[PDB]
Amino acid sequence: DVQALVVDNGSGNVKAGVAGDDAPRSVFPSIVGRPDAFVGDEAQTKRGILTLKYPIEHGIVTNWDDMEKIWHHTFYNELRAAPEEHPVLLTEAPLNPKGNRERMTQIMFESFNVPAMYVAIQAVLSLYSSGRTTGIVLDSGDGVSHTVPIYEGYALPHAIMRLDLAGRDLTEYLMKILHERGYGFSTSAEKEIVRDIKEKLCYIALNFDEEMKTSEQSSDIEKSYELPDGNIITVGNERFRCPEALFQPSFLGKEAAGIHTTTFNSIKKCDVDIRKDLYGNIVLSGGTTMYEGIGERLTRDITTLAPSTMKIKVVAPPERKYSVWIGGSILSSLSTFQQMWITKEEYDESG
Amino acid sequence: EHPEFLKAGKEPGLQIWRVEKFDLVPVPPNLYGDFFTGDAYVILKTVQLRNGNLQYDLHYWLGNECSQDESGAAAIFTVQLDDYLNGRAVQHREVQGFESSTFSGYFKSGLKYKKGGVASGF
Ligand SMILES: Nc1ncnc2c1ncn2[C@@H]1O[C@H](COP(=O)(O)OP(=O)(O)O)[C@@H](O)[C@H]1O
Ligand SMILES: [Ca+2]
Ligand SMILES: [Ca+2]
Ligand SMILES: [Ca+2]
Ligand SMILES: [Mg+2]
């Protein structure tokens, strides 16, 4: 009967909207600024007088007062919805501790008085949005990436991998390597420009060493970008060296495994009898999976790592930037959603 | 509580539902075996075992032109049905033109497709 609200609590941006829409109507940065408080874009608008905090910097909420300000902004400033009059679907990170889930549930029921809610794991929603019940989701967002094997609808928690390596690290790495050309982007505002350069110009090489060799033979690699002040910047091999850090985290000074190795290791944590279904359903999700070339490169790299009798398929849905939110929109629209949620009355008497 | 869940898996046979507007709607039995390319479906095959218990196979069939709400809902309804059947179903994803032999074998006349379908809920 009533329409649910869908809130994807992103490490970088909140995605929010109504159940039944094909995309979130609200997308804003998961930032709170204080000299009360400002949220999102208005808090960036006012960098100069506010101290900014990321209350969900790596996908797990760490500051509940700031997170409540984000949720208030979501309901009141973005959706103009009374939270006490709608069921809410909220997303959580893979491996979110139960105590953190319980705290978000307490806030929703006792600070916002939501009448019913459901908490969903982000990667599971993305898998459903791809039309699958079994597969492994590689979710790469702003402050965190995870690989999440899912079998017959349920994540396998012993096999989930977290990487503290996602889009914000790539933005910072592009800012670093552009110093080779003499650029000195360093301020917050400049970081947002570099993020846009990254999204517009970067791509993933099918074979990094060969791309380095071909790019140095001509200037065909170089592609340009108009800065806010009208000057033009030209970027060459940084276009593919930046997202190469996903595969080679040593470029960032990290000892971590790359995303191909991590995907492989997650599948191997699952029993042999289901691995074929995971290898055949590797589903990309999140903004940091949007690079041109990613599916082809991952296919080549995971095929090399995996047994040769496995059949590797990497699925890169065109709307994968918001697949978490979309999966939540579908789930909370189903005729069965009413039977999934927890009500405030139940919570208040036995929660 | 959903009426079609309450009907699911009670007797040996073949139950087919189409995703329509975020709901699971029975397919008219006259149309069994003919699938709209524009739609997604959930299929429960129930078999009587000699020991007396029932065996369940859940298939979700995705037409080449079905919308994302439909394919997503078919996947979710498959999980929810399996849960309602106490996890005792095996789940199978069936894509138009690449369906398993088991799925094809449920239809004596074989699988056929038809243009069109029910409108997306999105
Ligand atoms: N087209 C693109 N190419 C590469 N990176 C992108 C693209 N679009 C967005 N991103 C990056 O994706 C990240 C945001 O992804 P998102 O999935 O929304 O993260 P989260 O859910 O963690 O907030 C940012 O680092 C952003 O720069
Ligand atoms: Ca191999
Ligand atoms: Ca349809
Ligand atoms: Ca099962
Ligand atoms: Mg995310």
Author numbering:
A (entry chain A): 5 to 39, 52 to 367
B (entry chain G): 4 to 125
Show the paper's wording.
Only after aging the crystals for several months could we obtain data explained by an ADP-only model, termed Mg-ADP-PfActI. Crystals grown after exchanging the nucleotide in solution after complex formation also contained a similar mixed nucleotide state. These findings were corroborated by anomalous difference density maps, in which peaks of >4 σ were found for Pα, Pβ, and Pγ in Mg-ATP/ADP-PfActI but only for Pα and Pβ in the Mg-ADP-PfActI. The Mg-ADP structure does not contain excess electron density or anomalous difference density at this site, despite showing anomalous difference density for the Pα and Pβ atoms of ADP. This suggests that K+ leaves the active site upon Pi release. The overall structures of the different nucleotide states of PfActI appear very similar, but principal component analysis (PCA) with a set of 147 unique actin structures identified 2 conformational shifts during the reaction pathway: (i) opening of the nucleotide-binding cleft and (ii) slight flattening upon inclusion of Mg2+, followed by twisting of the monomer upon completion of hydrolysis. The twist angles of the mass centers of the SDs (θ) were used as an independent measure and showed angles of 19.0°, 17.9°, and 20.0° for Ca-ATP, Mg-ATP/ADP, and Mg-ADP structures, respectively. In the Mg-ADP structure, only conformations 1b and 2a are present at equal occupancies. Upon ATP hydrolysis in PfActI, Glu73 in the H loop undergoes a conformational shift, whereby the backbone is flipped and the side chain orients toward the ID and interacts with Arg184. In Ca-ATP-PfActI, Arg184 is engaged in a cation-π interaction with Tyr70. This interaction is preserved in the mixed structure but is dissipated in the pure Mg-ADP state, after an interaction transfer of Arg184 from Tyr70 to the flipped backbone carbonyl of Glu73. Despite the mixed nucleotide state, we were unable to locate free Pi anywhere within the structure, even after soaking the Mg-ADP-PfActI crystals in Pi.
